[PDB]
């Protein structure tokens, strides 16, 4: 279930009926590749298929030699968030593995499985994963074909599968080199879909967190980094840093915001009012977590994937703006102008319209076309049954999601302003904030007569 | 000088375990291959396992697959060779040998020869 | 493992040249130049001769030469002397990924 309610008197709607998935913390794997030790081959053998073999050799060790060189290097309202260090986490746990005989605990853990749980010096646990055996393969399969006296390979299919497997050698390596050692998002190459679910399946989290994971691995590849750390001692290891979700299923919303301006016919005598708070609302530990930067939220169907380190914490009275922008107990967050031009904001279930000036706004269906046409000021059309909106030479195509819509009618408050002392020069103000300053304005005109 | 001492030379009876030490000193113990050689009495040599440098990939023989298990430890300069369900077979001088080829090499082919050998010590399983 | 086929006697004097025959299939011996010799005398632990075909370390005199064809690799002492009469044996990388050692041969300079 999804609804939505317009309020007339701010210019502005909701979208009730989400679900969240806030990262709240990180997880840090360490993915291992074991690399084997190629010397030189002393045959000038002109067989066509020792050629290609000793070219995808080439390619191998120049592979490692890039890796070398990388592993040499240390890896409205957006402007109110803090700044953190997204792979401040990861790189911590790469340090460690520069440590003298670290690398060798993971060597040897994974000596007879894949997949281990090991205990670093510092005390941490982190689960460590082989996605790839070049040592064995090379020792085991290839080097005995490549270096015979006889100097020539037998089939054709060897040349090929030493082709198939260290593909993935080569493919990570490119991705590290235009990237300086961090991607994001974890590509297919860095942890494939199966290794990525069995990781999670292995992660020390509640059963819900790993159904999450499993259920959205797409939104989990956004949000997690590979982060290149040592390539030493026939290993290459990389950190991948996974998200970890520590609030999951509590209620968020979606504010919409658009400006709101007076109708007057003379052209520049008009004031416009927008509220600044649009973005996402979450119910987190009693509090409310807000991310202004609604583009660093994931929607996939009714789950809202967001990441804290994007997010103010509000008191829960922020909620009160949207049925009472002049409630006593939240300064609600708007700007000022006299720019009153014409614009859609396009909301989960409908399109706010702020139509102004000589604009032609228009609301259209597939069938029918033209439905409805907009007179000055603000107003809303709900998606049931309109397919588009025009405003000006702009055309908007609205969210075809189902869900209930309502039109909560009220006085647009623009209207309770007298334009002599109200302020409309404030990009980055609040309800208090103009109230304060319409007295600061009032003020030197009441104290001039009280002279006389 | 370049010198393998292998000891612990004891009796032991057959179902049991024997673990072999050999130690080394006067080179570079993290930078060769170790080999472990043994020889029935009056019968020929017969090879047993390597560990590479680092003792991540070791190779045993198919006579033996299964049942020893070698390992390294390069903190100590030491080589050692686990031994499971001994049978009389088993009876041999187990000679301690390096590798022929200094690096990190981690395949068999690169250091399948030796060149320095140790004195041996018998191992004699009877019940 | 498959043992190496060794003469298991050579007989010599003094003076004169020998060789030491070392069998193999085309997996261990015809196939790879990783085929060394060792000589052991009764006692003491045995000595590298040959590395690979014929290459020798310091040491070992130039009468110690090795050679392979086939799948036969050969050593030759030429001008024997009392210091030679030891056994020998052939090792060989297998192609499985192991070592494996001949079957052995006695040396005996004729007194």
């Known amino acids: 279930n999804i609804t939505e309610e317009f309020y007339q008197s701010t210019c502005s709607a909701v979208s009730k009926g989400y679900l969240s998935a806030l990262r709240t913390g990180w997880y840090t794997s360490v993915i291992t590749i074991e690399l084997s030790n190629i010397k030189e081959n002393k045959c000038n053998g002109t067989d066509a298929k020792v050629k290609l073999i000793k070219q995808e050799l080439d390619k191998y060790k120049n592979a490692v030699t890039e890796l070398q060189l990388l592993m040499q290097s240390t890896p409205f309202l957006g402007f109110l968030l803090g700044v953190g260090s997204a792979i401040a986490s990861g790189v911590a746990v790469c340090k460690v593995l520069h440590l003298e005989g670290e690398v060798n605990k993971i060597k040897s853990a994974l000596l007879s499985t894949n997949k281990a749980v090991v205990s670093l010096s510092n005390g941490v646990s982190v689960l460590t994963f082989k996605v790839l055996d070049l040592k064995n393969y090379i020792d085991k399969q290839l080097l005995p074909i490549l270096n015979k006296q006889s100097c020539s390979i037998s089939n054709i299919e060897t040349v090929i599968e030493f082709q198939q497997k260290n593909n993935r050698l080569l493919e990570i390596t490119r991705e590290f080199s235009v990237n300086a050692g961090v991607t994001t998002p974890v590509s297919t190459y860095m942890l494939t879909n199966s290794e990525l679910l069995s990781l999670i399946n292995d992660m020390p989290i509640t059963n819900d967190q790993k159904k999450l994971m499993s259920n959205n691995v797409q939104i989990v590849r956004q949000q997690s980094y590979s982060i290149m750390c040592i390539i030493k001692e026939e290993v290459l290891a990389y950190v991948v840093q996974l998200p970890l979700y520590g609030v999951i299923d509590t209620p968020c919303w979606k504010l919409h915001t658009s400006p709101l301006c007076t109708t007057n016919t003379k052209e520049g005598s008009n004031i416009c009012l927008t509220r600044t708070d649009r973005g996402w609302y979450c119910d987190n530990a009693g509090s409310v977590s807000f991310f202004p930067q609604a583009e660093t939220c994931k929607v996939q169907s009714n789950r809202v994937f967001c990441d804290t380190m994007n997010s103010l914490t509000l008191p829960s009275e922020v909620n009160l703006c949207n049925v009472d922008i002049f409630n006593p107990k939240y300064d609600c967050k708007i700007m000022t102008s006299k720019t009153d031009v014409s614009s859609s904001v396009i909301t989960s279930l409908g399109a706010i319209v702020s139509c102004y000036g000589k604009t032609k706004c228009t609301a259209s269906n597939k069938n029918r076309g033209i439905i409805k046409t907009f007179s000055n000021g603000c107003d809303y059309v709900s998606n049931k049954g309109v397919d588009t909106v025009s405003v000006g030479n702009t055309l908007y195509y609205v969210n075809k999601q189902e869900g209930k819509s309502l039109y909560v009618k009220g006085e647009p408050i623009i209207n309770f302003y007298d334009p002599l002392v109200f302020p409309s020069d404030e990009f980055d103000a609040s309800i208090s904030q103009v109230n304060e300053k319409i007295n600061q304005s009032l003020a030197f005109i009441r104290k001039s007569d009280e002279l006389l | 000088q370049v010198q393998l001492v292998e000891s612990g030379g004891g009796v032991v009876q057959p179902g049991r375990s024997l673990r072999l030490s050999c130690a080394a000193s006067?080179?570079?113990?993290?930078?060769?291959?170790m080999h472990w050689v043994r020889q029935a009495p009056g019968k020929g040599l017969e090879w047993v396992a390597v560990?590479?440098?680092?003792?991540?990939?070791?190779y045993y023989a198919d006579s033996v697959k299964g049942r020893f298990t070698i390992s390294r430890d390069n903190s100590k300069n030491t080589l050692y060779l686990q031994m499971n369900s001994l049978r009389a077979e088993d009876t041999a001088v187990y000679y301690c040998?390096?590798?022929?080829?200094?690096?990190?090499?981690?395949?068999?082919?690169?250091?399948?020869?030796?060149?320095?050998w140790g004195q041996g010590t018998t191992v004699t399983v009877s019940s | 493992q498959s043992a190496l086929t060794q003469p298991a006697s050579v007989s010599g004097s003094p003076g004169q040249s020998i060789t030491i025959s070392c069998t193999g299939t085309?997996?261990?011996?015809?196939?790879?130049?990783?085929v060394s010799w060792y000589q052991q005398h009764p006692g003491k632990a045995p000595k590298l001769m040959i590395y690979?075909?014929?290459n020798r370390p310091s040491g070992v005199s130039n009468r110690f030469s090795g050679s392979k064809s086939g799948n036969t690799a050969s050593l030759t002492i030429s001008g024997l002397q009392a210091e030679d009469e030891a056994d020998y044996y052939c090792?060989?990388?297998?192609?499985?990924?192991?070592?494996?050692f001949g079957g052995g041969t006695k040396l005996t300079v004729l007194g």
């Open positions: 090792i060989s990388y297998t192609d499985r990924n192991t070592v494996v």
């Open positions: 006067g080179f570079a113990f993290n930078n060769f291959a």
């Open positions: 560990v590479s440098y680092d003792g991540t990939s070791p």
């Open positions: 085309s997996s261990d011996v015809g196939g790879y130049v990783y």
């Open positions: 040998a390096r590798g022929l080829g200094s690096g990190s090499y981690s395949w068999i082919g690169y250091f399948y020869a030796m060149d320095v």
């Open positions: 690979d075909v014929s």
